[PDB]
Design a protein around this ligand. Structure first.
Ligand code: CLA
Ligand code: CLA
Ligand code: CLA
Ligand code: CLA
Ligand code: CLA
Ligand code: CLA
Ligand code: CLA
Ligand SMILES: CCCCCCCCCCCCCCCCCC(=O)OC[C@H](CO[C@@H]1O[C@H](CO)[C@H](O)[C@H](O)[C@H]1O)OC(=O)CCCCCCCCCCCCCCCCC
Ligand SMILES: CCCCCCCCCCCCCCCCCC(=O)OC[C@H](CO[C@@H]1O[C@H](CO)[C@H](O)[C@H](O)[C@H]1O)OC(=O)CCCCCCCCCCCCCCCCC
Ligand SMILES: CC1=C(/C=C/C(C)=C/C=C/C(C)=C\C=C\C=C(C)\C=C\C=C(C)\C=C\C2=C(C)CCCC2(C)C)C(C)(C)CCC1
Ligand code: SF4
Ligand code: SF4
Lengths: 164, 64, 98, 80, 41, 144
């Protein structure tokens, strides 16, 4: 109960929706022989379904009046009430990989600018240079702040403009 | 004497209406006459018309 | 015989060397990119054989082997429909109650 | 009629005149380039404004320049 | 086969190998770790 | 030598069965444009109005409604056939006007004596702002 909400292990619409999905799977299962190949896949779907409900109720997700889990996207209401794995932990688990790709592509461009003709190594990617920059880009925030402290991250007004 | 940059020096364009403004190319020839735009610069960057070369004047030209 | 078989032995050498060079077919595209319009002109002018060369013999050879490529793709497609009808179907069941 | 002006960035490579589908343009003696020649627009009454001249100008920020003005029966390109 | 390896290093071939790699990595993850809505432990 | 040739309609037309792309009422009320060329041999050329005509040996005369049709015909006669055509301008009151090679020389070659109209002795980036040409009577470009 952060903003009119309720834990999903407490709310009854969540359990009613679990029983609704298991009821649809059960009346779907009632047509087949108990050991046939469709019935095995239907019971495996039931097992994945029940494991999904158990692990959404276990992590302390907040349900609403609809019986559906919600995501508190504010630190200080996620850190204080234990919901940092909703948004606040994957908002850095994403940005590590985002700045990773943005650093690997940056360094692949800068390490191919100073050649004979760079464009041929942009349609035909130099794979050993690409995999070297793929592995050694693991510490990208480190190298990014060390590049920002120089001023070698930005370029000055050598850039191309029109008519200011 | 030979006015302008040399035969193969890198150069920076100061013509604001050009496609290669603040952008670096190679001088390939400087015309030694009373031509308004003697400095011929070739670029790797082609423009929208697909052209990599242009004439420029002496005030629209600065080295490096 | 006016109507007779008439071919040319070994006209084009089988090599991956021109697979390394995109735009080998075109006189304008063979110089490489400087502009992202190049890579769209590569795929747009890829099968326009009449604009690559002016020799009608070479155009006819390209369009006669491209038809074998299309036929091989149709046989891959039909063979896949027969395979998916064999291994992943209820056709055995469907024949008893269609 | 359209307004067709040229500028002193002309290199005199006479490509606008060959590109012109209406003979608006012609090459005039001049002493500001190596080719000793510059274009001219004496016949802008016949111009339609199709801008083939400034698809053919090699100079960066085109030396020929068509300004779409009033439209007569020749500027609209009408056989009727 | 040096020309074949330069063909393998072109843009669409690297694109269709790397996208199958990053597809079939996430697909094996969502097989062995079903339904990750929230970062658990 | 060359001084402004005249026209007679006595010169024949190329053999052409007639298309629906010919002249309209603008030819009878406003103006129509006639083209002449001397051909060396009888050969087939594409009409700018659609269709193929065969030109005959000697002088030809063919009439159009646009200057672009006549200059397109000159463009394919000078390139494909290496002929030297010239077209005029005819008003319905009989007044004829010499239009193509004014000085005889085709306009892509310097004749050393034609006058340079509509030239700006300044760079196109050195145009004024449109605030400087505002209220010039009519609406007006800064290139003037
Ligand atoms: C931007 C919008 C957006 C967002 C935020 C999400 C978010 C999510 N979607 Mg969703 N989705 C979207 C758009 C979006 N989606 C769209 C447009 C579609 C339609 C195509 C879908 C279709 C869809 C389906 C069908 C499913 C999801 C699922 C999910 C969940 C992800 C679970 C997962 O795969 O964990 C991935 C977790 C990771 C930790 C992956 C990281 C990779 C590794 C571990 C890191 C690197 C390690 C190592 C260094 C790599 C080795 C490198 C190698 C070279 C050796 C998550 C809640 C799944 C789910 O459970 O739903 C809740 C699911 O089944 N989505
Ligand atoms: C869009 C900006 C924004 C807004 C409107 C709020 C809104 C709120 N924050 Mg919050 N917060 C934000 C960004 C924001 N936060 C950011 C970027 C951080 C740092 C990561 C925090 C850290 C934070 C803490 C630590 C706390 C709040 C608290 C609060 C509440 C008072 C209110 C719901 C407080 C709270 O729990 O409510 C009483 C509280 O203790 N916030
Ligand atoms: C027997 C069938 C046949 C054949 C052999 C050709 C052959 C040719 N056509 Mg032609 N054409 C055809 C049918 C055919 N066409 C049909 C049915 C149409 C009407 C749509 C056209 C319309 C057409 C036009 C308008 C033009 C051609 C052109 C060409 C030439 C070059 C084509 C090329 O390089 O494309 C290379 C291949 C591509 C560019 C890929 C196209 C991708 C399509 C449009 C997207 C749809 C794909 C898929 C079905 C959608 C799902 C995809 C999924 C990933 C979402 C070549 C001579 C061009 C030409 O001659 O230039 C002068 C040209 O301009 N054709
Ligand atoms: C029906 C599908 C089909 C077929 C038969 C062809 C056939 C061909 N393409 Mg083509 N192509 C296709 C779809 C197809 N294309 C599509 C959808 C695109 C994207 C728009 C292209 C883009 C493309 C490019 C860019 C080029 C070709 C080229 C070629 C030729 C080389 C043949 C070769 O090396 O095969 C051997 C390859 C195998 C994989 C063997 C099959 C086993 C051949 C005419 C090349 C060409 O025309 O050179 C003259 C070339 O450079 N194609
Ligand atoms: C153009 C025809 C065509 C099409 C559209 C498909 C499409 C499909 N096939 Mg199929 N197949 C085809 C021809 C075709 N096949 C042929 C000719 C054969 C014989 C070699 C097979 C043999 C085959 C097998 C053995 C299986 C499929 C499977 C599949 C499915 C998943 C494929 C996948 O995940 O890629 C895999 C990704 C990469 C290879 C990369 C998909 C519906 C799978 C399936 O239906 O599972 C239930 C499966 O197990 N196909
Ligand atoms: C007309 C639209 C258009 C088109 C067609 C392209 C096309 C392209 N851009 Mg591009 N771009 C565009 C607009 C466009 N761009 C715009 C508007 C911008 C913003 C200014 C950019 C900014 C941009 C950047 C910054 C980069 C590109 C790159 C590329 C190339 C992708 C290479 C690739 O497939 O990597 C395939 C790579 C992988 C699948 C991953 C690598 C896997 C490794 C090799 C391991 C394999 C085992 C390709 C030629 C990239 C490039 O040329 O460098 C390669 C690049 O870095 N573009
Ligand atoms: C390139 C990415 C990639 C990666 C990292 C993996 C990784 C894995 N696969 Mg996998 N797989 C992939 C692509 C990939 N697969 C593709 C494209 C297919 C074809 C559709 C398969 C088909 C496949 C099968 C059939 C099996 C695996 C299995 C496995 C596991 C042990 C090997 C491991 C988690 C095996 C497994 O279940 O783990 C023991 C197994 O039986 N994979
Ligand atoms: C497809 C099935 C056909 C097999 C491939 C035939 C190759 C014919 C050929 O060019 O070989 C002959 C080529 C040698 O080719 C030589 O190349 C030289 C420069 O490259 C010169 O150009 C010579 O003219 C040319 O003969 O041999 C190889 O390089 C074979 C490459 C190995 C291909 C194996 C493909 C494996 C598929 C897995 C990929 C996923
Ligand atoms: C389908 C087959 C799938 C496997 C093919 C993938 C490799 C193809 C390749 O790029 O060509 C094979 C490339 C070709 O290697 C070099 O590439 C150059 C690029 O211009 C030129 O082509 C050179 O001729 C060639 O020698 O070989 C490699 O460099 C392999 C590097 C190791 C790749 C795995 C590294 C670990 C994964 C990276 C993640 C970090
Ligand atoms: C906590 C959080 C939050 C909040 C947030 C915020 C509030 C933020 C802010 C932010 C900001 C205020 C920002 C700003 C910025 C600025 C700038 C300026 C930046 C920049 C960047 C850059 C520049 C980068 C670069 C790079 C790198 C380094 C990597 C990759 C590559 C590149 C190059 C791109 C939320 C709740 C939502 C969610 C959860 C989490
Ligand atoms: S518009 Fe451009 S092209 Fe058409 S006529 Fe006037 S100048 Fe020549
Ligand atoms: S504009 Fe371009 S083409 Fe026309 S004259 Fe000046 S340079 Fe030659």
């Amino acid at each position: 109960d952060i903003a009119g909400l309720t834990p999903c292990s407490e709310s009854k619409a969540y359990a009613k929706l679990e029983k609704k999905e298991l009821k649809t799977l059960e009346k779907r299962l009632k047509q087949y022989e108990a050991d046939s190949a469709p019935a095995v896949a239907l019971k495996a779907t039931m097992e994945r379904t029940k494991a999904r409900f158990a692990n959404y109720a276990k992590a302390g997700l907040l349900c609403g009046n609809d019986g559906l889990p919600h995501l508190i996207a504010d630190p200080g209401l996620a850190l204080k009430y234990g919901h940092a794995g909703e948004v606040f932990i994957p908002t850095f688990g994403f940005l590590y990989v985002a700045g990773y790709i943005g650093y690997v592509g940056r360094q692949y461009l800068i390490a191919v600018k100073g050649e004979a003709k760079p464009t041929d190594k942009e349609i035909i990617i130099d794979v050993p240079l690409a995999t070297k920059l793929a592995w050694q880009g693991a510490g990208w925030p480190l190298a990014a702040v060390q590049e920002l402290q120089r001023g070698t991250l930005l370029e000055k007004e050598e850039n191309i403009t029109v008519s200011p | 004497k030979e006015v302008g940059p040399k035969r193969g020096s890198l150069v920076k364009i100061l013509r604001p209406e050009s496609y290669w403004f603040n952008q670096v190319g190679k001088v390939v020839s400087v015309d030694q006459s009373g031509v308004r735009y003697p400095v011929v610069v070739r670029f790797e960057n082609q423009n929208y018309a697909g052209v990599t070369t242009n004439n420029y004047a002496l005030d629209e030209v600065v080295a490096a | 015989k006016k109507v007779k078989i008439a071919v040319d032995r070994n006209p084009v050498e089988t090599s991956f060397e021109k697979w390394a060079k995109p735009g080998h077919f075109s006189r304008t595209l063979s110089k490489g990119p400087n502009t992202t319009t190049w890579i769209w002109n590569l795929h747009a002018d890829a099968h326009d054989f009449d604009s690559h060369t002016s020799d009608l013999e070479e155009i006819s050879r390209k369009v006669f082997s491209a038809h074998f490529g299309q036929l091989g793709i149709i046989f891959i497609w039909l063979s896949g429909m027969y395979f998916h009808g064999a291994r992943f179907s209820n056709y055995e069941a469907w024949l008893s109650d269609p | 009629a359209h307004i067709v002006k040229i500028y002193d960035t002309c290199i005199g490579c006479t490509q606008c005149v060959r590109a012109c589908p209406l003979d608006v343009l012609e090459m005039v003696p001049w002493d500001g380039c190596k080719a000793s020649q510059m274009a001219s627009a004496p016949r802008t009454e016949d111009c339609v404004g199709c801008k083939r001249c400034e698809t053919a100008c090699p100079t960066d920020f085109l030396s020929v320049r068509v300004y779409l003005g009033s439209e007569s029966t020749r500027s609209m390109g009408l056989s009727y | 086969m040096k020309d074949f390896t330069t063909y393998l290093s072109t843009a669409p071939v690297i694109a269709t190998i790397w996208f199958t790699f990053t597809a079939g990595l996430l697909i094996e993850i969502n097989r062995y770790f079903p339904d990750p809505l929230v970062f658990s432990f | 030598a060359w001084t402004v040739p005249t026209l007679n309609p006595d010169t024949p037309s190329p053999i052409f069965g007639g298309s629906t792309g010919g002249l309209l009422r603008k030819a009878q009320t406003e103006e129509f444009y006639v083209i002449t060329w001397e051909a060396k041999k009888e050969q087939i050329f594409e009409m700018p109005t659609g269709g193929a005509a065969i030109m005959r040996q000697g002088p030809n005369l063919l009439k159009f409604g646009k200057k672009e049709q006549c200059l397109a015909l000159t463009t394919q006669l000078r390139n494909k056939f290496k002929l030297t055509p010239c077209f005029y301008r005819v008003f319905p009151d009989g007044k004829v006007q010499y239009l193509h090679p004014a000085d005889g020389v085709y306009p892509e070659k310097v004749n050393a004596g034609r006058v340079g109209a509509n030239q700006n002795m300044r760079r196109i980036g050195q145009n004024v702002n449109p605030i400087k040409v505002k209220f010039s009577g009519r609406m007006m470009s800064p290139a003037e």
